[PDB]
Ligand binder design. Structure first.
Ligand SMILES: [Ag+]
Ligand SMILES: [Ag+]
Ligand SMILES: [Ag+]
Ligand SMILES: [Ag+]
Ligand SMILES: [Ag+]
Ligand SMILES: [Ag+]
Ligand SMILES: [Ag+]
Length: 40
């Protein structure tokens, strides 16, 4: 669960919706769409 980072999602849901831009284990590399089952 490595989500102690800055939301690094290059999507439109994270890059914008800051409701989940602070606790997602996305390994600051998330750059795909079927690799973002993030909701927080
Ligand atoms: Ag994220
Ligand atoms: Ag995302
Ligand atoms: Ag992403
Ligand atoms: Ag996200
Ligand atoms: Ag986010
Ligand atoms: Ag995420
Ligand atoms: Ag993601």
């Amino acid at each position: 669960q490595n989500e102690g980072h800055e939301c690094q999602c290059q999507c439109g849901s994270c890059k914008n919706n800051e409701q989940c831009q602070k606790s997602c284990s996305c390994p600051t590399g998330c750059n795909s769409d079927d690799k973002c089952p993030c909701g927080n």
